[PDB]
Design a protein around this ligand. Structure first.
Ligand SMILES: Nc1ncnc2c1ncn2[C@@H]1O[C@H](COP(=O)(O)OP(=O)(O)O)[C@@H](O)[C@H]1O
Ligand SMILES: [Cl-]
Ligand SMILES: [Cl-]
Ligand SMILES: [Mg+2]
Length: 260
């Protein structure tokens, strides 16, 4: 009953072109605001029990209350069939951006100081979520969005295959904790320092557990500072408990950036 303040009236929403397509489609849209003005949004669609539907609205109400510059907001949900409504980020996801920087007509070559700042943004957003015991469960550069001022925010968390982002302990069992998000953040850092390489070249998805079980990890990128590799490497320690917290990671990266 009380969790209806997360619901948006359908006729305040206009749906346009598809941005992306398995168990959902994401579309551009316009949302009319209490302001009277209209905002550009991205809309992701997704039993029929009353117990299961309240569990969704609660989670959504939770996410709508998140307010941090490095965490994307949930604007609300429309129910026709549920659709979650997020602000549209014109500059798109960090992974594509990273690939474009390696091509003419894309952003310029991204210097080290900018790549590190991206990692600090993501660490902060992750620290914010972790502080609220909210597991992300799908961190990767493709899920880090660029705001119009070029700050990075984490996205596509909560509300419920990317094998190469999944921590060893989570491959082995049905186990996902904050330390698994930390593993994923290391992979995301590696994606950023490689300017968008797919993790583990030469390793196939189905080989990933055997490969990790043998103690192999993502290799240091060619010209990336030893200090930076040490930080990402600590994210993949076999024992989840030996991995640093996000608060620890975030300060390590700030101090590294500050040193340059
Ligand atoms: N809030 C948003 N604003 C703008 N584009 C978005 C937003 N959320 C997702 N997208 C884009 O829509 C497409 C589909 O997103 P998604 O289904 O989350 O796929 P992916 O697996 O690439 O992250 C992607 O290209 C993604 O970058
Ligand atoms: Cl590549
Ligand atoms: Cl590798
Ligand atoms: Mg996504």
């Amino acid at each position: 009953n009380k969790l209806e303040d997360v619901v948006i009236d359908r006729n305040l929403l206009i749906l346009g072109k598809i941005l992306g397509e398995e168990f959902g489609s994401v579309m551009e849209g316009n949302l009319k605001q209490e302001d009277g003005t209209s905002l550009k949004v991205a809309v992701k669609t997704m039993n029929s029990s009353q117990r299961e539907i309240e569990e969704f609205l609660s989670e959504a109400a939770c996410m709508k209350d998140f307010s941090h510059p490095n965490v994307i907001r949930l604007l609300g949900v429309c129910i026709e069939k549920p659709m979650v409504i997020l602000p549209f980020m014109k500059y798109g996801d960090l992974h594509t951006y990273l690939l474009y920087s390696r091509l003419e007509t894309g952003p310029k070559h991204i210097p080290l100081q900018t790549l590190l700042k991206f990692m600090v943004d993501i660490a902060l957003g992750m620290e914010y979520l972790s502080n609220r015991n909210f597991l992300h469960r799908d961190l990767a550069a493709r899920n880090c969005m660029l705001r119009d001022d070029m700050t990075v925010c984490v996205a596509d968390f909560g509300l419920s295959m990317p094998v190469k982002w999944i921590a060893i302990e989570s491959l082995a069992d049905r186990v996902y904790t904050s330390k698994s998000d930390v593993w994923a953040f290391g992979v995301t850092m590696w994606e950023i320092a490689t300017r968008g390489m797919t993790p583990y070249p030469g390793v196939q998805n189905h080989e990933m557990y055997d490969y990790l079980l043998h103690g192999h990890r993502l290799k240091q990128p060619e010209d990336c500072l030893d200090e930076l590799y040490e930080i990402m490497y600590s994210c993949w320690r076999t024992d989840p408990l030996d991995r640093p917290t996000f608060s620890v990671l975030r300060l390590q990266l700030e101090k590294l950036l500050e040193s340059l």
